[model samples]
Target chain A: IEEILSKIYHIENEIARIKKLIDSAINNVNNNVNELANNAVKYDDASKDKITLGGGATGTTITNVKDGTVAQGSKDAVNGGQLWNVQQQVDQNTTDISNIKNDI
Target chain B: IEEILSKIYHIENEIARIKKLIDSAINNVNNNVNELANNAVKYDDASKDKITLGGGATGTTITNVKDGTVAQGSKDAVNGGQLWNVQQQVDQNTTDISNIKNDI
Candidate 1:
């Protein structure tokens, strides 16, 4: 009767509404994935040779990077402070050597 | 009349099936977001003082980190090799100064 016909129409309208929601949700998830892919540092995406910080942007400081292990067998990144100490040693050595040369 | 009633039931079942799929997809996306949040470095989440490498693990090497800019104004990280060269200069200066002292 008229009741059965009306029920079918209502059910079909509900199904269409859900389909629109599904599309919207899927689109949102896709955007999140792309944003992450663009910004994140992937460890195993390409070769293991290098991991570029700031996506290889120049003048970008990788701030607060912890001091890595220092050894001949270790492949760690040395901080600016550490390198400054090394440079200080070189400066002292240079000054001392020059003074000795003058005395000689 | 019977055919119309049957169609209503079929449409309702299709709607239920779609609802399940939407739940499943949303769940999957949630998982991917969690995994990325754990592993990826965020740029604007917390304060910008520093970025920890190797997830703050001890003795972990940040392998193949590119040589950062070397300047007083720069905040880039220096490679171990660069530090080694600075050390080499210090070693040479030390030896030279010692020899000059002996001569004097």
Candidate 2:
């Protein structure tokens, strides 16, 4: 009986450890998505002046400042324009992260 | 000895229950924050045209369409402009959620 009790305790502890890992991973993915979305909005805002000055239409012509250049805008255009683009990337990233949850 | 073992088992079960509750609470908080952030972005996008037409300063008077009247622009102004404000709220909520985790 003592041995049985010890074994049960051990298994329970193992279960607890696994639960913690799962919890952390889930939280991390969620955090990443939120951060990405926030970043996207930030970058989108940052590029506002350049996007406006360039006379480029909003949404479509708004370049992802991180990877793509403000093709038609001033070089000094908002540094965070990439943030909007990053937001898209982050959205995609969020999708991928969500898949991880599904898999688990 | 048997009674002692039973007591230990009872305590272990209690600990597990508490742990599950903590985990759930943490996850729920994060989920709410993420949802709030997403909604904010959506609202901001919807209100874009109204904001533009209202000619009010960006980021200043764009009314919360969810609760307030569009005091500046056409009635047809995008309905989601409040998303930007919601995003801010979500950010604040995320902070609150983080605090909950710390308290635990």
Candidate 3:
């Protein structure tokens, strides 16, 4: 029947359209994954291929970074608060040593 | 006629299978995006809803971090090498002050 042929034609066209949509959607998702990979900080040792977070010789500020490990061999990123604590210690030591010099 | 009907049935089954596969693939990609979102650091100021890293009440070390901008108003993460430089300065100041105390 002509109606049966028409229905088959319509279904075939729909299948073709869906196949194209799937291809487009997958490619779009792939692009997104690539972008994220390029921007994200990986959790691996990149001693040879270090990841730099900057552009045009200026570093970007990474806000809301959780405090990282503080050790001599640690490659972790330290926050300002940790540096402030160290600064305070140095300040106290400087004051104490200054007082000692004055007494001497 | 029977062969044509059988071919139609096979095509319908194939379309259904393809649809299911597309759904599964999309969900997998969605899950990956969600996981990446949860783990990656955001570039927005979260003064109210700060993001913290790590689990079990312990912080995780973010390795291979590039040196961030060093400024009082900057919220960038500094590496151990930068802290070492600060420590060296503190050490130098300590030694200089100790020598001054001895002279006094």
Candidate 4:
């Protein structure tokens, strides 16, 4: 009986170690995802500001604006916006993985 | 040697069981996070629609609008916007916790 108890204790310790490892993995993923999401939001806000400025050109008519200038400005604005959207999607995917990690 | 082999088998089984439990937990967390994030997106879209409708004003001047009307409209818009921001933060935090859980 004592021998059996000893084996059980040893097994329990091993189990505890595994649990600890699992917890650590979860934490790392969670922190990364959080940072990514927050950074994405900041990027999104910055992109919005860029779009506002790009759109603020004083030209009253499309023809009055220099050719390609408006298009290039809009492209830059959209590029910034796209960065945020992409980051947001990535964050959402990470969140999914994190939740899945818990189940594993 | 046979006796020792039996003991090893028993311990291995226990370890496998514990591993399964850890895996299940990880999967559960991942799924939950995904659902939550998706739902948040839906809520944000709905809120934006509400704001758009509220912001549609036909009156020629501000004075013709009912007292508290503009304030209420702006409040609703801001409230909706805040919900999206709050959910983003919550999602980020959950991701952090999920990573932490994995470490364990």
Candidate 5:
């Protein structure tokens, strides 16, 4: 049981790390896309309006930037899919981490 | 121990789900960033070479992309951190799953 707990602890740490990655990654992508969009919108005459995601917080928003017509899911590879996938991962890892603590 | 295995199974599934999300999420963000970069570099013709990640494979790649000074992380959040974090999770989970199977 101690061994199991140890493994669970490690997994839990990984979960936290991944969750942070999700939030940070989402924010990073959003920031860059938004920056480019705004730059184009404000200054880049050739640049056009684009769609980015409100990956920052929940309520899952669609942000307007001077970039795209829409975010990645419309095209794939991904647009907002990073946030959505990581969101699910974060949600599930939260549960698993909690359960590990409960079991321990 | 049987109860433990059951719990482990559930956790293992979560790990798998999260791993899948990480891969998908990484791909998604990369594709979008690349597409936008390409568009600007070619059509708009106002883009410069940017640094994305070679998140697809190991060895920590730095990809040459259009319209960026660099990828995330170094920028903060992460350029390839999603894949890196999830990759570590997957590696650990693989070992944990094997251990669980052995114990079972």
Candidate 6:
């Protein structure tokens, strides 16, 4: 039926839209993982103290570097989880047609 | 995101329309089977031995009775197959969301 065909057309568009959500999530994941990877490489350099006082004297220091690892880790976990879930949903959607075809 | 919600909203409407096609198929099947039942009853009476000749003979009849069954059967098969296929598609669509939920 044409009514059915139009409905299929509409759903095809809906699926296309959903694909973009996964794309968005993937971008989030890609950005955060890269950030984490960048910070992870500098762990040894940042983990130990770096003296900044002149003439070989100790100096007071403020630090936010290690905190970045923590921050990016949190972000990566969140984004990774998000992207995984979105991909799962997308994969699941594809299965629906197969299952339905079986029953039909 | 709200964008995702809107997409889900659109798919919901599309599924609803597909439901109608299944409903329409079921209605068609119901109608034709009923018609077949109505005609099947008259077969015995029309099978030749009716005393329409006013004494001992039955008048001639132009027969299209068998043809009616064939027509309805063809239609029923088409519509019934249609109904099954649509139901399959609908079922498949539902699984998409569930599968997505699972992966998420």
DockQ of 1: 0.36
List model 6 lDDT by residue over B7-103, tens digit each. 6667787666655664575556556555644433121121222212111232222111111123542321112232233345655666655675566
lDDT of 2: 0.47
Q: Candidate 6 residues A1-104, lDDT tens each?
A: 56556756777886676567556645655565454343221212654432121211232121111111112112111112333544565566667646655754
What docking grade applies to model 5?
incorrect
- Alpha-carbon TM-score of each model against the true structure: 0.71, 0.33, 0.56, 0.29, 0.37, 0.22
Q: Can you list each candidate's DockQ?
A: 0.36, 0.03, 0.20, 0.03, 0.02, 0.01
Residue-level lDDT for A61 in candidate 4:
12
Candidate 2 chain A weakest ten by summed lDDT? A61-70
Q: Candidate 2: where is the Cα deviation over 4 Å? A: A2-5, A8-12, A15-19, A22-30, A33-104, B42-104
lDDT of 3 by residue, A1-104 (tens): 66776777788788888888888989899788879967775423322122344333544455555666777875455677667667777878878777866775
Tens-digit lDDT track for model 5 on A21-47? 888878888887766664331222345
Q: List native contact recovery per candidate, as a fraction of 1.
A: 0.41, 0.01, 0.25, 0.03, 0.01, 0.02
Residue A102 CA displacement from its true place in model 4, Å: 75
Q: Deviation in angstroms for B86 in model 3? A: 3.3
TM-score, candidate 3, is 0.56
Give the lDDT of residue A5 in candidate 6. Answer: 60
Ranking by DockQ: 1, 3, 4, 2, 5, 6
Worst 10 residues of 3 chain A by lDDT: A42-51
Candidate 6 whole-model C-alpha lDDT, 0 to 1: 0.40
Give lDDT tens digits, candidate 1, residues B53-79.
Answer: 545544334556666678886655566
Candidate 4: regions farther than 4 A off:
A1-20, A32-104, B1-4, B42-74, B78-104
Q: What's the CA error at residue A13 for candidate 4, in Å?
A: 12
Superposition error at A82 for model 6 (Å): 46
Highest TM-score against the true fold, candidate: 1
Query: What is the alpha-carbon lDDT of model 5 when measured against the actual structure?
Result: 0.49
In order, the Cα lDDT scores of the candidates are: 0.66, 0.47, 0.66, 0.45, 0.49, 0.40
* Model 5 lDDT per residue over B1-104, tens place: 87986887798789879978987987798688868754432212123222222223321222221222235533222223343455457557656655654663
**Reference-based lDDT, residue A91, model 2:** 62
Between 1 and 4, whose lDDT is larger?
1
| Candidate 1, pairs of clashing residues | A63-B50, A63-B51, A64-B50
